[PDB]
Tab-separated table of all heavy atoms in Angstrom:
chain	number	residue	atom	x	y	z
P	18	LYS	N	0.801	-1.206	0.000
P	18	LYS	CA	0.000	0.000	0.000
P	18	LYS	C	0.836	1.258	0.000
P	18	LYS	O	0.496	2.247	-0.650
P	18	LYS	CB	-1.228	0.040	0.904
P	18	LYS	CG	-1.048	-0.577	2.278
P	18	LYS	CD	-2.332	-0.563	3.087
P	18	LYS	CE	-2.082	-0.618	4.585
P	18	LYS	NZ	-1.341	-1.819	5.018
P	19	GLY	N	1.947	1.193	0.721
P	19	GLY	CA	2.852	2.325	0.767
P	19	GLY	C	3.355	2.648	-0.636
P	19	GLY	O	3.246	3.767	-1.130
P	20	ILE	N	3.898	1.639	-1.304
P	20	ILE	CA	4.430	1.833	-2.630
P	20	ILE	C	3.409	2.294	-3.651
P	20	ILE	O	3.678	3.194	-4.446
P	20	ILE	CB	5.073	0.575	-3.142
P	20	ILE	CG1	6.544	0.581	-2.756
P	20	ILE	CG2	4.924	0.626	-4.651
P	20	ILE	CD1	6.833	-0.235	-1.503
P	21	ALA	N	2.255	1.647	-3.656
P	21	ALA	CA	1.215	2.017	-4.591
P	21	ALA	C	0.823	3.483	-4.439
P	21	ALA	O	0.482	4.188	-5.392
P	21	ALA	CB	-0.010	1.132	-4.437
P	22	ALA	N	0.851	3.974	-3.214
P	22	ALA	CA	0.488	5.362	-3.055
P	22	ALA	C	1.574	6.265	-3.617
P	22	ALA	O	1.303	7.207	-4.350
P	22	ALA	CB	0.183	5.658	-1.604
P	23	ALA	N	2.825	5.964	-3.291
P	23	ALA	CA	3.923	6.759	-3.792
P	23	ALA	C	3.879	6.761	-5.305
P	23	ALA	O	3.991	7.805	-5.942
P	23	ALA	CB	5.233	6.194	-3.302
P	24	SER	N	3.688	5.574	-5.873
P	24	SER	CA	3.606	5.463	-7.313
P	24	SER	C	2.518	6.370	-7.841
P	24	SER	O	2.699	7.143	-8.768
P	24	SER	CB	3.443	4.035	-7.788
P	24	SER	OG	4.592	3.297	-7.417
P	25	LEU	N	1.361	6.303	-7.220
P	25	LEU	CA	0.305	7.182	-7.661
P	25	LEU	C	0.759	8.635	-7.521
P	25	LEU	O	0.664	9.452	-8.429
P	25	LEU	CB	-0.969	6.931	-6.851
P	25	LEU	CG	-2.140	7.702	-7.435
P	25	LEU	CD1	-2.322	7.304	-8.895
P	25	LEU	CD2	-3.418	7.377	-6.665
P	26	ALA	N	1.295	8.974	-6.368
P	26	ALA	CA	1.739	10.329	-6.175
P	26	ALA	C	2.660	10.719	-7.302
P	26	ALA	O	2.527	11.763	-7.924
P	26	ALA	CB	2.481	10.444	-4.856
P	27	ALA	N	3.626	9.857	-7.557
P	27	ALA	CA	4.601	10.131	-8.595
P	27	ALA	C	3.922	10.468	-9.895
P	27	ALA	O	4.265	11.433	-10.566
P	27	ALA	CB	5.523	8.951	-8.804
P	28	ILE	N	2.948	9.648	-10.250
P	28	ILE	CA	2.271	9.915	-11.487
P	28	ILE	C	1.466	11.197	-11.439
P	28	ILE	O	1.268	11.813	-12.477
P	28	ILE	CB	1.528	8.750	-12.125
P	28	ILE	CG1	0.201	8.517	-11.437
P	28	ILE	CG2	2.334	7.458	-12.099
P	28	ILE	CD1	-0.774	7.802	-12.362
P	29	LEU	N	1.012	11.624	-10.262
P	29	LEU	CA	0.265	12.872	-10.220
P	29	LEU	C	1.255	14.025	-10.161
P	29	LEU	O	0.991	15.165	-10.552
P	29	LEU	CB	-0.678	12.976	-9.010
P	29	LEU	CG	-1.719	11.874	-8.931
P	29	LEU	CD1	-2.533	12.018	-7.649
P	29	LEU	CD2	-2.639	12.006	-10.130
P	30	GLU	N	2.422	13.723	-9.613
P	30	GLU	CA	3.416	14.749	-9.515
P	30	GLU	C	3.677	15.175	-10.931
P	30	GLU	O	3.550	16.336	-11.288
P	30	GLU	CB	4.708	14.155	-8.951
P	30	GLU	CG	5.809	15.215	-8.857
P	30	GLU	CD	7.022	14.729	-8.116
P	30	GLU	OE1	7.811	13.918	-8.576
P	30	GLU	OE2	7.133	15.278	-6.929
P	31	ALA	N	4.001	14.153	-11.709
P	31	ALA	CA	4.328	14.220	-13.118
P	31	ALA	C	3.308	14.960	-13.963
P	31	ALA	O	3.581	15.359	-15.093
P	31	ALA	CB	4.527	12.810	-13.640
P	32	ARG	N	2.110	15.128	-13.431
P	32	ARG	CA	1.096	15.847	-14.168
P	32	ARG	C	0.952	17.253	-13.636
P	32	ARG	O	-0.053	17.935	-13.809
P	32	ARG	CB	-0.223	15.113	-14.251
P	32	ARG	CG	-0.449	14.744	-15.703
P	32	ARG	CD	-1.370	13.562	-15.927
P	32	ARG	NE	-2.563	13.960	-16.656
P	32	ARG	CZ	-3.550	13.120	-16.923
P	32	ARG	NH1	-3.503	11.840	-16.547
P	32	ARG	NH2	-4.611	13.581	-17.583
P	33	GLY	N	2.007	17.652	-12.945
P	33	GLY	CA	2.156	18.963	-12.359
P	33	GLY	C	1.231	19.244	-11.209
P	33	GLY	O	0.747	20.358	-11.083
P	34	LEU	N	1.001	18.259	-10.356
P	34	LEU	CA	0.113	18.493	-9.246
P	34	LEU	C	0.831	18.630	-7.924
P	34	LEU	O	1.872	18.016	-7.672
P	34	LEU	CB	-0.925	17.385	-9.159
P	34	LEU	CG	-2.089	17.672	-10.084
P	34	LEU	CD1	-2.822	16.372	-10.398
P	34	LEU	CD2	-3.044	18.654	-9.421
P	35	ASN	N	0.245	19.461	-7.077
P	35	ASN	CA	0.802	19.659	-5.765
P	35	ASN	C	0.294	18.540	-4.894
P	35	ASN	O	-0.867	18.492	-4.485
P	35	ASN	CB	0.478	21.018	-5.159
P	35	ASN	CG	1.379	21.196	-3.973
P	35	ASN	OD1	2.224	20.325	-3.712
P	35	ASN	ND2	1.186	22.304	-3.264
P	36	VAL	N	1.200	17.618	-4.665
P	36	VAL	CA	0.820	16.428	-3.976
P	36	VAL	C	1.616	16.050	-2.754
P	36	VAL	O	2.782	16.396	-2.598
P	36	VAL	CB	0.955	15.354	-5.029
P	36	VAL	CG1	0.853	13.983	-4.393
P	36	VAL	CG2	-0.156	15.572	-6.041
P	37	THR	N	0.948	15.283	-1.899
P	37	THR	CA	1.561	14.776	-0.693
P	37	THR	C	0.934	13.468	-0.231
P	37	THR	O	-0.135	13.073	-0.687
P	37	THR	CB	1.587	15.820	0.421
P	37	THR	OG1	2.425	15.340	1.445
P	37	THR	CG2	0.175	16.040	0.947
P	38	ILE	N	1.630	12.802	0.678
P	38	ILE	CA	1.190	11.549	1.239
P	38	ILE	C	1.393	11.538	2.734
P	38	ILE	O	2.285	12.192	3.266
P	38	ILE	CB	1.965	10.375	0.665
P	38	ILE	CG1	2.302	10.630	-0.801
P	38	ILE	CG2	1.199	9.064	0.851
P	38	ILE	CD1	3.376	9.688	-1.336
P	39	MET	N	0.554	10.764	3.409
P	39	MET	CA	0.654	10.626	4.848
P	39	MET	C	0.285	9.222	5.272
P	39	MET	O	-0.541	8.559	4.638
P	39	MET	CB	-0.017	11.751	5.653
P	39	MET	CG	-1.527	11.682	5.728
P	39	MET	SD	-2.227	13.263	6.252
P	39	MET	CE	-2.443	12.948	8.014
P	40	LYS	N	0.950	8.750	6.314
P	40	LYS	CA	0.714	7.394	6.759
P	40	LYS	C	0.162	7.397	8.164
P	40	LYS	O	0.711	8.059	9.042
P	40	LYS	CB	2.006	6.586	6.658
P	40	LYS	CG	2.067	5.313	7.488
P	40	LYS	CD	1.054	4.265	7.047
P	40	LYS	CE	1.476	2.825	7.325
P	40	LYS	NZ	2.832	2.697	7.873
P	41	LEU	N	-0.921	6.649	8.361
P	41	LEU	CA	-1.558	6.531	9.658
P	41	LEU	C	-1.266	5.158	10.226
P	41	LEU	O	-1.646	4.173	9.611
P	41	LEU	CB	-3.079	6.757	9.554
P	41	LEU	CG	-3.442	8.233	9.648
P	41	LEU	CD1	-2.698	8.999	8.562
P	41	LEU	CD2	-4.950	8.426	9.512
P	42	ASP	N	-0.577	5.088	11.363
P	42	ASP	CA	-0.246	3.803	11.944
P	42	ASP	C	-1.114	3.434	13.135
P	42	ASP	O	-1.245	4.199	14.093
P	42	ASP	CB	1.264	3.592	12.194
P	42	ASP	CG	2.083	3.392	10.931
P	42	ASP	OD1	1.804	2.546	10.088
P	42	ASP	OD2	3.128	4.200	10.831
P	43	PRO	N	-1.726	2.247	13.049
P	43	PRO	CA	-2.582	1.742	14.101
P	43	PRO	C	-1.839	1.352	15.374
P	43	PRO	O	-2.457	1.004	16.367
P	43	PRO	CB	-3.236	0.469	13.560
P	43	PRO	CG	-2.464	0.076	12.328
P	43	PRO	CD	-1.730	1.323	11.883
P	44	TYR	N	-0.521	1.354	15.381
P	44	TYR	CA	0.131	0.932	16.597
P	44	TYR	C	0.183	1.936	17.727
P	44	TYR	O	-0.006	3.140	17.560
P	44	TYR	CB	1.374	0.075	16.407
P	44	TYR	CG	2.294	0.778	15.463
P	44	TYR	CD1	3.017	1.888	15.907
P	44	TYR	CD2	2.418	0.364	14.134
P	44	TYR	CE1	3.894	2.560	15.054
P	44	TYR	CE2	3.286	1.035	13.270
P	44	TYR	CZ	4.023	2.131	13.732
P	44	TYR	OH	4.879	2.817	12.896
P	45	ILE	N	0.365	1.386	18.911
P	45	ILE	CA	0.354	2.195	20.102
P	45	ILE	C	1.636	2.929	20.390
P	45	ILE	O	1.619	3.934	21.065
P	45	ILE	CB	-0.172	1.462	21.319
P	45	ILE	CG1	-1.194	0.397	20.914
P	45	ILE	CG2	-0.810	2.482	22.245
P	45	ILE	CD1	-2.561	0.966	20.564
P	46	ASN	N	2.757	2.462	19.878
P	46	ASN	CA	3.960	3.222	20.126
P	46	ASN	C	3.709	4.673	19.779
P	46	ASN	O	3.092	4.996	18.776
P	46	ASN	CB	5.140	2.660	19.335
P	46	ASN	CG	5.096	1.160	19.410
P	46	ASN	OD1	6.002	0.511	19.938
P	46	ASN	ND2	4.006	0.610	18.908
P	47	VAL	N	4.146	5.572	20.624
P	47	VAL	CA	3.881	6.949	20.319
P	47	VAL	C	4.492	7.330	19.002
P	47	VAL	O	3.933	8.142	18.275
P	47	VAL	CB	4.416	7.868	21.385
P	47	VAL	CG1	3.855	9.255	21.120
P	47	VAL	CG2	3.953	7.356	22.738
P	48	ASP	N	5.653	6.747	18.734
P	48	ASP	CA	6.400	6.978	17.513
P	48	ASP	C	7.312	5.797	17.329
P	48	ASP	O	7.507	5.045	18.275
P	48	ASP	CB	7.218	8.289	17.512
P	48	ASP	CG	8.473	8.285	18.349
P	48	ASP	OD1	9.335	7.429	18.290
P	48	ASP	OD2	8.564	9.322	19.144
P	49	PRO	N	7.892	5.668	16.145
P	49	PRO	CA	8.766	4.549	15.858
P	49	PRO	C	10.115	4.635	16.536
P	49	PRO	O	10.863	3.663	16.559
P	49	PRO	CB	8.896	4.444	14.339
P	49	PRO	CG	7.797	5.331	13.766
P	49	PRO	CD	7.207	6.144	14.916
P	50	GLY	N	10.419	5.794	17.108
P	50	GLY	CA	11.685	5.974	17.793
P	50	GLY	C	12.005	4.821	18.732
P	50	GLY	O	13.165	4.591	19.064
């Protein structure tokens, strides 16, 4: 899912769009640190 989104982003980037991605993690760790 991560890759597919980036790929999509890439293709939208390429069409001159202002794009971004964000990941929502279901885990309890406050952060991956």
Side-chain angles (χ1 to χ4, degrees):
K18 41 183 204 301
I20 270 98
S24 297
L25 188 57
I28 78 156
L29 301 176
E30 179 171 73
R32 246 156 117 183
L34 276 158
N35 193 3
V36 169
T37 192
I38 325 165
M39 76 197 263
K40 161 65 152 355
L41 274 57
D42 288 307
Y44 52 75
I45 330 283
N46 318 243
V47 191
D48 75 51

